[PDB]
Amino acid sequence: ETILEVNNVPTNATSLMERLRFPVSAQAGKGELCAVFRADPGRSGPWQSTLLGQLCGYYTQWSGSLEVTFMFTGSFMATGKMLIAYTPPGGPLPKDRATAMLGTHVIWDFGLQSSVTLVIPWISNTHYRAHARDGVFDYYTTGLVSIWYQTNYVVPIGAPNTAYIIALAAAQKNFTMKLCKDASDILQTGTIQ
Amino acid sequence: SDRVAQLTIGNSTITTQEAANIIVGYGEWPSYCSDSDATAVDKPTRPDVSVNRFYTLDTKLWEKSSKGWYWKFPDVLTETGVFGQNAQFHYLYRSGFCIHVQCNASKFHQGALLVAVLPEYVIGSVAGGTGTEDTHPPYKQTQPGADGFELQHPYVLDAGIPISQLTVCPHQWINLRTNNCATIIVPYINALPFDSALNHCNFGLLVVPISPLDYDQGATPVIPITITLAPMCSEFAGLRQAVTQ
Amino acid sequence: SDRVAQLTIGNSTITTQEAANIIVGYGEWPSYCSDSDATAVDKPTRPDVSVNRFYTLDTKLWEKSSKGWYWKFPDVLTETGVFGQNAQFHYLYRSGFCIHVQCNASKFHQGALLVAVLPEYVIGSVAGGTGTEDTHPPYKQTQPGADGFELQHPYVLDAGIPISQLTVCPHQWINLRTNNCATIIVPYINALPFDSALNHCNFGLLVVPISPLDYDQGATPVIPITITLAPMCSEFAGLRQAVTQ
Amino acid sequence: GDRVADVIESSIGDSVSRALTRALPAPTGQDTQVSSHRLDTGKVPALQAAEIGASSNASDESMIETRCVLNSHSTAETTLDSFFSRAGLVGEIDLPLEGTTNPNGYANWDIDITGYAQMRRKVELFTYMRFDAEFTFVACTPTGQVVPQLLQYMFVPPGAPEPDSRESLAWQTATNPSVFVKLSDPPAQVSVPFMSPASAYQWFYDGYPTFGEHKQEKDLEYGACPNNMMGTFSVRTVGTSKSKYPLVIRIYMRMKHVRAWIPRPMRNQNYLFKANPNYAGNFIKPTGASRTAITTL
Amino acid sequence: GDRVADVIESSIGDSVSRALTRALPAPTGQDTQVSSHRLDTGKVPALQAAEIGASSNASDESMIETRCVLNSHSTAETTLDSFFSRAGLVGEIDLPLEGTTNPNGYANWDIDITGYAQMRRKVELFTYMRFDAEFTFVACTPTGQVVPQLLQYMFVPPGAPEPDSRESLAWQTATNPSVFVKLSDPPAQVSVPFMSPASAYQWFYDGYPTFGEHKQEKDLEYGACPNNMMGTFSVRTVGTSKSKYPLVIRIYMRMKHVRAWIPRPMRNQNYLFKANPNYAGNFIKPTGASRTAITTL
C-alpha cells in the first residue's frame, strides 16, 4: 500500500500537503460529484506519484488497476453515505448519480466503516499502439472512477464541519509487467559534481 | 448482487463504518415461490437476472415541517426511476420484495418515524369538494414519481382512513433513539394470479413521522432517508400489438 | 426457436409446401463451444437466450443484370437490421452461426449462384485512382446495410482478388437446376480471444451469380433470395463510460 | 455450447418435520430462580412470576369442574357469520297506481351496498371477500292491506340487456330466471350464487362487454344510467294493463358462507359518493369525544 | 424461487472412441460385382474398377524394392520452411560521405515487406502467421573496397523514441540493444524474437501508445513520418565527427519457425500503396494470356 494523491491542484511549496487528501465538507449533499480520474499508471496524474506507477515507468505492458482503499478521518460522530462507481473502458462518465448507480458500484457509510476496498477488474480487447510511424494515430481511452455525494454529511452540534478522506493504492497477483524498456526522465541537473 | 454491480458505493452522507445493521428474521433467502394457475390462453415467463441486484432511488430529506411521503408500485419499477428497460414492453408482472430502509443521525437528535405497507392502497385524492363519483381517475397524483409525494392530511391519511389503526399492516418503528435499520419483506398480494403493467397498481408504501424531529441549534438541521429494494422472484411476459417485425 | 416466436410465417412468395430442404451433415446441434483465455483485467459473460431464435432479413431480388452482393458481420447484428436491443451496449462479442440460404424458382429457369464466407474480408474499395495510403478508412461503404450492396467488378472482387480461386473458403453451389437449399456453419474466427463491438468487423458473406439467370418471355422475370441466420453460442459484456447511474 | 445459468434463491436445512396428531396440551415449564427479591434494590422494581399450565377438564385431572359461570350461554358469538347475522332492509322499491316514480309498472333495481352507509362501513373492513347471497320479498300496500294480485320477479345476470318497457321481450326471454307468486302467499325465499368473475369481490374493470379499469380511452363506465353492469333485478305487475292497488315491495339481503382477507383500518370520515371514497378535506373532524384537559378527566 | 433456465445446445452419443496406436495401413477392400460389362448397353459407358492396397516396403512384403527412380534426391522440398527458404535483400541503406540522403551519418530504417512486391505477394497468401526472424549485415564501398572503420548497430523495440541526431542520447541509452563491429570483420549474424502483441501478425490498432484502429477520433496513424511505431533499426558511423569513406550497407532478412493460418486467394491486380490494397479499378486487366479462339488453340 502507498498513499495516492488525487487533489493534485496545488503547485506551490507550502500548500504541497493537501495534494494527498481532499475535503468532504457539508455544503451540498444530494447529487453532485466529488472527483474523478483515470486508470493509466504510467502516463500522468495520480499513479505517477505512487510506487506502482513508478515501477510501470520501466515497462510497456501495464495494468495500473485492481484494488484501492479509502481511509476516513471523521472525528467520531460523523455519518453519511458515499457512492463509489467504476466505468468500464470505452464508456462515458454518467451525468447523474442514478446512471452511475447502474453497472457496478458500492455505497459507503461512516457509521462503523472507516475503510473500504473497491477492486477494479481487468479487460483487454483492443490494440494499445500499433504505430508503424508516429504522428498519425491519437486514439487512446480508458475507464474511469467517480465519487458521488449520496447523502448530506450529518454532524452533531459541536463537531467540526470539514473532514478529509485519504486514498490508497495496490494490486494483487494477477497482472505482470513486460517488455523491459529504458526509462526516460528529466531527473537531472547537468551539474552533478 | 453482493453489494456491487454498477452501483458500488457503500458510504452515504455520514460515511459510516463499523459493519451493517439488518437484523434478519428469516433464514437467508427462504426458497423460491410458486407459479399458480390461470384460466385463459395466456402464459408468462421469467427474466431470471438483471433485476436480481439492489436498487437505491433518490434520498428524501426530513425536516421539522415534514408531513410524510408515500410511494406506489410498481410505478418505481417502470421508467419512473432507475429501471425502465424491461418494464414497459411485457404485460404480466409479479414479484416479492426485500425492502430495506436505512436512516442516519447523531446521538443528539430526537424523533421517530413509522413504515407500513398498505395493499391495494387506492387514494381518495385530496377531495374536500371535488365532486367525482366515476368520471376520470387521476394520473397526475396516483403516480407522482420515484421521489414520492408529501402528504396533505396525514391524520386522515389523505383518504379518510385514520392513521391510528395503521399498525394492522406489517410495520416497523424507525426510532432515532436507538437503531436506524428497517428491513421488511412483502410477498405477492393480488386477487388475480398475475398482474398487468397498467393501472392495476399494487400495494403502496407509507412513511409517516409521528414523533416530530427536533434538536438544538447549531447541529445538522436535516436528516436523510435512504430507500432500497430487491425484487425477489419477478416475471415479465405478454405482448401483442399492431404491425410487427 | 422451433419455427415460431414472434415471426411465425413459414411460407414465402411461392407459398411452397411438401416438407423442407436442409441436408444436414452434423448431428443435430453438435455440443457447446469453448471460453478460451485472456491477458487483462476484463472478463465477459453470456446473454443465454433472446438471440437463440432464427432471423430472416430482407429479400434481395435476382435479375439478368445482377452482379452479386456481400454482407459484413456483425454489422447486421446491430441496429442495422432486425436486432439492435442488446448489440450496442456491451463491448465483447463472439458467436458461431447457422446460416441458411433458401432460393425458389420454377422448372423453366436457368442459372447458378455461389455462396462463400471470407474471413477478415477487408474491402479495398472501388479504388481506381482514389489515392489513399492511410488517411481515413470509409464507413459509408464497408457498412452498407442489412440489405447488402451490389458489387462493382466481381471478377476482381472489387478488391483485386481473383474470383476464380474463391472456392478455397467454405462454399456451396446454389444451382437453379436441382436444389434450392444452402446450409453453412461458421465457427468463431479471430486472432484475439474476443472481439469488440466496433470496427473490427469479422468475416463477410459473398454471393456471386456465375451462371447468369435466363429464361423465356412470359414467365416470372425475378427470382427472390432468402437469407436466414442463427447465432450459435453468443456472448455480450463489457461497459464503462462517463457519468453513471 | 451453453455458458450462462443462474437462479439460486433457495435455502436448505430445517424446512419441515415429523408428522403427528397430538392435539392435547400437556404440563409445560415450571420455575427458574434469578436473584434477591427486593423493592428498591437498585435496578428495576415490580418483578415478575410464572405458572405451569392447565386446559379445562380435558387437560390434567377432571376431579372438579368449577367454571366461571354455571353454563350461562354459548361462547362463540364472534365468528364472521355471527358478525354478519341479521338481514337488513336493503331494497325499498315502491310502486304507485299512478305518478312519476314508476308509472309503467316496471321497476329496475340492482345489488349494491352504498344504499346503507352503516352496512358499507361494516363490510369495508377488509379487501377481499367471498360469500353467497339470499333474498326475501315482502309486498304490501302503503296502508298495509293485502290484496289479490300476481307478481313477476326475475333475476338478471351480468351483461344481460335491460328490460325498459312492460312490452319488452326481455320480460319473456328464456335465459333470465323468473319467479311468479301471488302476494297473499308467503314471501319468496330465494338464493343467489357467487357471480363474480374472480376469486373475490373487487370493482374496476369487471363490468361491461367492452373495456374498463382506470384511465378510459376505449370504454365508458356509464352504460347509460345503469353504471357497472352486474347482477340486477326486475319486477312487473302481471297483467295486460295497469293494476288496481298501490304496492310497496321490500328486499332482505343476507350473506352466507362469508370469508374475508387482508383487514384494513375501518374509516374515520363521512362517506361522500359511490365507488370513490372521497372525504371532507376542508371539514376534517376528530374521532373521539375530546375532553378539556389531560391532567383531569 | 427460480423459474427460468435454458441453455441446451448439446448432442449426445458417439462423441469419441477407443485409444490405440496402430500407425500402419493394412489390406483394405477387395471387389464387388455389378452387372454385364458392355460399351453401349444403354445407361452409361466408361465403367470403373478398384484395387486393394499397399504402402511401400513397410506394408505387406518387402521382397522387392522397385521405386520409380533409383533414389535421385529428397522428396520433401514443399513444406512452409522449404517455401520460405532464401534470404532476400530487403534493406539497401546507403551512406554517402556528403550529400542529401544521409548527411549526418545516422540512418533510420524499419521492418516491412512492401519493399519487395514479390515478397509481399508470396507472404499474403494467408491471414495469420507466426515466425521468428534473423538478420545479416554487409557493408561495402560503392566501388566495393573494404576500409578500416567501426560501425554501431542497434535494434529499437516498438514504442521506443526515434534517435534523430547523432548527438541524441537515445544512441547512448541502456535498454536498446546495440552491436559494435568493424566492417573488415565477417558480417553480423543476429536473430530477432517474435515481437508482436498478439498470436499472429495483423495490423490496425497495434502501434502507438495512443489509440488506433479504423475511424480515428483520438489518434493519428502518422506518428510524424514513422507511421505505425514498430520494430525499427538505427545505424551510425562511430566517431566524434564524419567518416572518410562512403558506405553501402545491406540487409538480409530470413524467416524461421513459420506457421500460417486461413489461406485466401492470392492476388490478381498490381499493388498500389502500403497498408491499403487498392487496385486499378479503371485499368483492370485479365489474368492469363488469352488466345484467339476456343475451338482451336
Ligand SMILES: CCCCCCCCCCCCC/C=C/[C@H](O)[C@H](N)CO
Ligand atoms: C371502484 C370502487 C372502489 C375503488 C377503489 C377503492 C378501494 C379498492 C378496494 C375496495 C373496493 C373493491 C374491493 C371490495 C370491497 C367491498 O368489500 C365490496 N364492495 C364487497 O361488496
Ligand SMILES: CCCCCCCCCCCCC/C=C/[C@H](O)[C@H](N)CO
Ligand atoms: C492495415 C494493413 C492491412 C489492412 C487490411 C487488409 C488485409 C487484412 C489482413 C491482412 C493484413 C494483416 C494480416 C497480416 C498480413 C501479412 O501476412 C503480414 N504483413 C505479415 O507480415
